[PDB]
Amino acid sequence: AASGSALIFDEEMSRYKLLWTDPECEIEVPERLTVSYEALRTHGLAQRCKAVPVRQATEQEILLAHSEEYLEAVKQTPGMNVEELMAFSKKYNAVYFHQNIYHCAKLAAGATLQLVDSVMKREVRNGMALVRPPGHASQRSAANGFCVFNNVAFAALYAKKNYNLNRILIVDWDVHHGQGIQYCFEEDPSVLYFSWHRYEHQSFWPNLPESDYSSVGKGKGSGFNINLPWNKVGMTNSDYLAAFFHVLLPVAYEFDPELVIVSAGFDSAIGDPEGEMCALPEIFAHLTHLLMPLAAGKMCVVLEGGYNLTSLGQSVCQTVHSLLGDPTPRISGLGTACDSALESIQNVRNVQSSYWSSFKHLAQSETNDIVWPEPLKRMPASVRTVVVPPPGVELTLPKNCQHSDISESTAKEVQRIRDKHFHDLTDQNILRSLGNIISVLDRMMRSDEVCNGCVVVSDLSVSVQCALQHALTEPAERVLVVYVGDGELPVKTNDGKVFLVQICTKETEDKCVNRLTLCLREGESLTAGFMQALLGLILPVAYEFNPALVLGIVEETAAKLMRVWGHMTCLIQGLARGRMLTLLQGYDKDLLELTVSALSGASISPLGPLRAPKPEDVEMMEKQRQRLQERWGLLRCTVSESW
Ligand SMILES: CC(O)(O)NCCCCN
Ligand SMILES: [K+]
Ligand SMILES: [K+]
Ligand code: NA
Ligand SMILES: [Zn+2]
Numbered sequence: 001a002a003s004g005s006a007l008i009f010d011e012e013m014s015r016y017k018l019l020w021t022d023p024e025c026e027i028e029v030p031e032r033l034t035v036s037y038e039a040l041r042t043h044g045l046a047q048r049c050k051a052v053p054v055r056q057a058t059e060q061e062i063l064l065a066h067s068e069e070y071l072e073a074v075k076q077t078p079g080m081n082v083e084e085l086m087a088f089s090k091k092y093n094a095v096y097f098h099q100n101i102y103h104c105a106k107l108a109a110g111a112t113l114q115l116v117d118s119v120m121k122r123e124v125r126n127g128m129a130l131v132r133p134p135g136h137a138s139q140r141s142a143a144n145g146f147c148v149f150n151n152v153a154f155a156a157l158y159a160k161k162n163y164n165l166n167r168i169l170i171v172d173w174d175v176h177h178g179q180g181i182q183y184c185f186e187e188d189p190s191v192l193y194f195s196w197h198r199y200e201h202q203s204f205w206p207n208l209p210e211s212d213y214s215s216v217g218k219g220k221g222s223g224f225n226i227n228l229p230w231n232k233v234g235m236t237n238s239d240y241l242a243a244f245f246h247v248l249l250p251v252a253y254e255f256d257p258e259l260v261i262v263s264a265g266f267d268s269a270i271g272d273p274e275g276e277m278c279a280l281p282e283i284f285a286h287l288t289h290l291l292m293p294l295a296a297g298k299m300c301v302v303l304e305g306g307y308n309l310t311s312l313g314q315s316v317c318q319t320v321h322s323l324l325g326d327p328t329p330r331i332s333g334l335g336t337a338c339d340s341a342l343e344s345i346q347n348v349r350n351v352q353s354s355y356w357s358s359f360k361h362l363a364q365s366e367t368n369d370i371v372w373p374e375p376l377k378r379m380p381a382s383v384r385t386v387v388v389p390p391p392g393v394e395l396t397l398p399k400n401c402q403h404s405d406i407s408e409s410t411a412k413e414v415q416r417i418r419d420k421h422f423h424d425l426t427d428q429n430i431l432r433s434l435g436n437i438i439s440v441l442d443r444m445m446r447s448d449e450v451c452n453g454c455v456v457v458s459d460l461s462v463s464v465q466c467a468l469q470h471a472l473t474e475p476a477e478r479v480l481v482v483y484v485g486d487g488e489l490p491v492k493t494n495d496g497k498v499f500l501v502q503i504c505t506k507e508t509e510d511k512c513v514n515r516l517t518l519c520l521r522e523g524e525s526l527t528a529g530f531m532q533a534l535l536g537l538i539l540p541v542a543y544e545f546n547p548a549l550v551l552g553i554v555e556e557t558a559a560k561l562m563r564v565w566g567h568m569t570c571l572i573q574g575l576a577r578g579r580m581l582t583l584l585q586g587y588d589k590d591l592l593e594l595t596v597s598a599l600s601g602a603s604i605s606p607l608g609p610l611r612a613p614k615p616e617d618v619e620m621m622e623k624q625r626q627r628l629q630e631r632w633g634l635l636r637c638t639v640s641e642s643w
Pocket of ligand 4: 089090092093094095
């Protein structure tokens with residue numbers, strides 16, 4: 001299974017620039033590449049990636065997406081003087097030409113294809129291409145919006161042709177619509193295109209009616225084009241995560257792509273003079289992380305726009321940090337998306353409801369200068385994952401995992417804890433696991449050397465109480481508990497420091513807003529239901545809660561449809577800088593193996609196709625959203641009714 005992250009870059013792509021006055025294009029400068037690579041070098045990220053060389057796209061590769069007549073016209077620009085280049089540039093909208101731009105365009109395109117090949121041949125897990133010129137606005141026969149050839153459209157058509165892929169997701173988080181990509185795949189159900197973009201009711205570039213939410217694709221491609229227009233500026237972390245949890249991710253995991261390509265424009269970040277949005281560079285760590293379980297981690301990130309050199313460098317580093325598997329930064333201050341974003345989100349979900357299972361319940365009444373703080377460092381843990389199997393069980397562990405070694409001070413604390421709170425306890429198994437829990441938690445919370453952990457335990461009540469209480473005094477200001485099992489746990493949810501998610505078999509009405517209890521009907525549809533609950537309820541609440549530790553718990557009677565556990569374990573590491581402790585009750589080799597693999601950052605196997613969720617499950621989940629969304633605004637995917 002593949003490892004490592006490709007970084008594709010060449011300073012030749014910085015060797016073209018604007019040669020005449022033009023306020024429209026003067027923001028697109030060679031230094032965008034210079035600053036981005038140097039930022040990667042400064043933070044040690046470039047040195048940890050596999051450098052893959054650029055190459056030129058061939059004529060045949062360019063003709064996959066562009067016409068012979070347009071290619072022939074651009075092929076003449078190396079021979080043009082400045083007067084001729086200015087006249088050629090005026091034939092198109094918001095683009096300039098240069099004697100070297102055709103050369104660099106072929107390099108930008110070939111760099112993208114090198115990235116696709118490295119990933120699809122399993123030479124790396126994922127990667128990023130830092131290229132100029134950008135691509136997503138160029139069209140079959142036109143340059144547009146600083147773009148000459150459509151790098152990301154190349155990549156999907158090339159991956160289709162040479163690897164016989166049937167399902168490719170393109171995520172365009174640039175602040176501009178990628179109209180070239182939309183047109184290219186408009187009728188194609190094999191390529192799902194998602195774009196959010198500043199729109200402001202069509203008054204923002206490129207000013208197209210077809211960039212609105214109503215453009216869902218055409219013909220057999222209906223439903224495979226998703227536009228989320230931002231109709232106000234100033235969108236925040238909360239708006240972007242609301243878009244992912246309530247539009248993009250439900251569709252992406254149902255689509256089940258075989259490759260993910262990201263049109264990564266960081267002009268959607270705070271400080272950008274084109275986007276004027278307010279999302280922090282740290283959000284891109286999470287946008288990257290939330291997509292990484294798709295396609296077994298095969299993600300090709302391709303630079304598009306991004307014009308504030310400071311914002312650009314930091315967002316590029318946050319993206320590569322996540323590609324490398326470094327712990328995600330904690331996002332504070334999350335809450336409801338703004339009303340304009342909620343309107344865009346509800347409109348997209350409604351028009352897309354004829355095409356996607358996660359939205360289908362919506363179709364029937366019965367159913368329903370700027371400055372910001374510098375980002376903190378993101379150190380990978382010395383040993384990412386510590387494992388404590390039952391005594392004697394020897395397992396083959398991934399390279400960045402390690403077995404537990406109870407210390408002297410730790411042993412004294414178990415004695416103190418036993419005397420005070422479990423007088424009768426003398427079971428020397430239980431007492432060993434308590435020493436393992438405290439030992440693992442101490443390494444997780446008081447060291448950057450261990451990130452997360454898994455401990456197999458015997459008695460849930462004592463181990464849960466010790467794990468929770470010990471974390472709450474480290475101190476962990478807030479703890480998210482995720483419990484797969486029935487019954488009640490020694491978990492008090494009164495003081496706001498604990499949020500409890502419970503996946504259980506018995507229908508039980510929960511009474512307050514710090515618990516989410518999910519009672520999913522048994523059957524062949526448990527998987528789709530849980531995925532729908534995870535993306536649409538669990539993750540929105542968990543992100544807003546912003547825990548300092550995640551405590552996972554699985555009762556023994558519930559280890560037999562839990563094919564979702566690896567996705568949850570991977571996605572929930574977006575919280576608490578990845579600090580997750582999982583307690584598995586009883587030995588199951590496969591569950592322990594899956595848990596350790598996901599905790600350690602390994603690729604997650606795809607879920608493939610799934611029987612769409614039970615309508616009773618969707619009803620249960622929407623009643624949870626209604627009950628919780630006034631407290632946890634990140635759950636909202638409609639505009640609230642005003643009094
Ligand atoms: C690559 C892009 O999407 O950032 N293009 C920006 C075009 C700006 C036109 N004023
Ligand atoms: K976009
Ligand atoms: K499509
Ligand atoms: Na012009
Ligand atoms: Zn852009």
